[PDB]
Amino acid sequence: KXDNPP
Amino acid sequence: SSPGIWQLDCTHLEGKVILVAVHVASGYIEAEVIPAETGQETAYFLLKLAGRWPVKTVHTDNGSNFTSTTVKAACDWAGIKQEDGIPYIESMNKELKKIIGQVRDQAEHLKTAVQMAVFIHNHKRKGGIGGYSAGERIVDIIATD
Amino acid sequence: SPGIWQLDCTHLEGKVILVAVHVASGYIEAEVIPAETGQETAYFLLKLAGRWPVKTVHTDNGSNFTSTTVKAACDWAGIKQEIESMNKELKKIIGQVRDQAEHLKTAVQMAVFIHNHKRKGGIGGYSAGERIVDIIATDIQ
C-alpha cells in the first residue's frame, strides 16, 4: 500500500 | 490535555482547501493548502506532521478523507491513533482566516498568505507581555529532558 | 544557537528534494518539489520559520536562494542568509523504505519520520526529534 494499496 | 494529541480541521477559502493541525494543549498550528480533501493529500499531510512532532492521537471531523484506507494506512504506519468524530479549534478557523485577511495583500498566492498567517499565529504573545507564544508552549509541553 | 539551520538540495528520480537540517540536533525537514525555484524555496523557508525559531540559514549558493522573493520572505520572517552527515543519511533511508511506497514524495516523508524518531545510542539515547525540542525548550530559559 503506503499511498496507493498494496 | 496530553502532549501527543492533535485536532485536524479543513477550512475553505477562495475555492481552495486549507488543512489545519492544531496541537490541542498549546494552540500551535500548522497548515497547508491542498487541491482537494482527498485521502492521498490528507495521508501525506499527516505523515509530514508526524515526522516532525511526536503525534500519538488525531481527532478529526470524520470527513470522507479520513475514512479512506490511504489515511488509515498512514496512521497505522505512523502508529497514530485515529479518533474520528471526537470533538474539542473552530474558533481556530475564524482566527486563522482573520490573520490571513491581514497579510493577504503581501502575497501573490493564497498559499503564501496561509504560511505567513501560521507564522503570526504561532509567534503571538498570548496573555500580555509576560506570556508565551503557541510555538513556545508546544516545545515546552513536548520536551522530554 | 537554537536558531541555525542548513538548507540543501538533493536530486533523485528526476525530482528535487529540499532538506533543512537543524545543525545542533540533526533534526530534518524535507519537501519534494518539481524544480528548485525561488518560489518553492521561499515558501519552504516560510513553513520552516512558522514552526521553529529560525534565525540563520546556511545555503549552497544557488540562484533559488537569491531571488527577490526569497529575500522578501527572509526579510519578513527575520531570517538571516549566509552536515552532509544527515544528507547521505537521508538518501540511505529513502532507499531502505523506497519499495514501501509508489511516490517518491511519500518515501521521503517516511524517511524524515524514521530519521527524526530514531533513538541514537542505547538506553539513555535521544532521537533528533527530542534533541531539537529539548535544545529549544532549554533556550526558552
Automatic annotation (TrEMBL), chain B:
Cofactor or coenzyme needed: Mg(2+)
The answer on whether this UniProt entry bears the keyword Cell cycle reads no
Recorded protein name is: Gag-Pol polyprotein
Membrane topology is: Lipid-anchor
> Chief subcellular site?
host cell
Q: What is the lineage of its organism?
A: Viruses, Riboviria, Pararnavirae, Artverviricota, Revtraviricetes
Where is this protein found? Host cell membrane; Host cytoplasm; Host nucleus; Virion
GO MF entry, a single one: DNA binding
Mind naming one GO cellular-component term on file for this protein?
viral nucleocapsid
UniProt catalytic activity: 3'-end directed exonucleolytic cleavage of viral RNA-DNA hybrid; Endohydrolysis of RNA in RNA/DNA hybrids. Three different cleavage modes: 1. sequence-specific internal cleavage of RNA. Human immunodeficiency virus type 1 and Moloney murine leukemia virus enzymes prefer to cleave the RNA strand one nucleotide away from the RNA-DNA junction. 2. RNA 5'-end directed cleavage 13-19 nucleotides from the RNA end. 3. DNA 3'-end directed cleavage 15-20 nucleotides away from the primer terminus
Q: Which UniProt keywords apply?
A: Aspartyl protease, Capsid protein, DNA integration, DNA recombination, DNA-binding, DNA-directed DNA polymerase, Endonuclease, Eukaryotic host gene expression shutoff by virus, Eukaryotic host translation shutoff by virus, Host cell membrane, Host cytoplasm, Host gene expression shutoff by virus, Host membrane, Host nucleus, Host-virus interaction, Hydrolase, Lipid-binding, Lipoprotein, Magnesium, Membrane, Metal-binding, Multifunctional enzyme, Myristate, Nuclease, Nucleotidyltransferase, Phosphoprotein, Protease, Repeat, RNA-binding, RNA-directed DNA polymerase, Transferase, Viral genome integration, Viral nucleoprotein, Viral penetration into host nucleus, Viral release from host cell, Virion, Virion maturation, Virus entry into host cell, Zinc, Zinc-finger
The organism named in the record is Human immunodeficiency virus type 1 (HIV-1)
Per the UniProt entry, what are the Gene Ontology biological process annotations, in alphabetical order? DNA integration; DNA recombination; establishment of integrated proviral latency; proteolysis; symbiont entry into host cell; symbiont-mediated suppression of host gene expression; viral genome integration into host DNA; viral penetration into host nucleus
In this chain the Integrase catalytic domain maps to 1-142
Coiled-coil regions, chain positions:
none
Automatic annotation (TrEMBL), chain C:
This entry carries the following GO cellular component terms, namely: host cell; host cell cytoplasm; host cell nucleus; host cell plasma membrane; viral nucleocapsid
Is Thylakoid set as a keyword in this record? no
Q: In Gene Ontology terms, what is a biological process of this protein?
A: symbiont-mediated suppression of host gene expression
**According to its UniProt record, where is this protein mainly located?**
host cell
Which of UniProt's keywords are assigned here? Aspartyl protease, Capsid protein, DNA integration, DNA recombination, DNA-binding, DNA-directed DNA polymerase, Endonuclease, Eukaryotic host gene expression shutoff by virus, Eukaryotic host translation shutoff by virus, Host cell membrane, Host cytoplasm, Host gene expression shutoff by virus, Host membrane, Host nucleus, Host-virus interaction, Hydrolase, Lipid-binding, Lipoprotein, Magnesium, Membrane, Metal-binding, Multifunctional enzyme, Myristate, Nuclease, Nucleotidyltransferase, Phosphoprotein, Protease, Repeat, RNA-binding, RNA-directed DNA polymerase, Transferase, Viral genome integration, Viral nucleoprotein, Viral penetration into host nucleus, Viral release from host cell, Virion, Virion maturation, Virus entry into host cell, Zinc, Zinc-finger
Give yes or no: UniProt keyword rRNA-binding.
no
The Integrase catalytic domain covers which part of the protein?
1-136
Q: Which GO molecular function, any one, fits this protein according to its record?
A: DNA-directed DNA polymerase activity
Give the subcellular location: Host cell membrane; Host cytoplasm; Host nucleus; Virion
Q: What is this protein called?
A: Gag-Pol polyprotein
Organism, scientific name: Human immunodeficiency virus type 1
Lineage here is:
Viruses, Riboviria, Pararnavirae, Artverviricota, Revtraviricetes
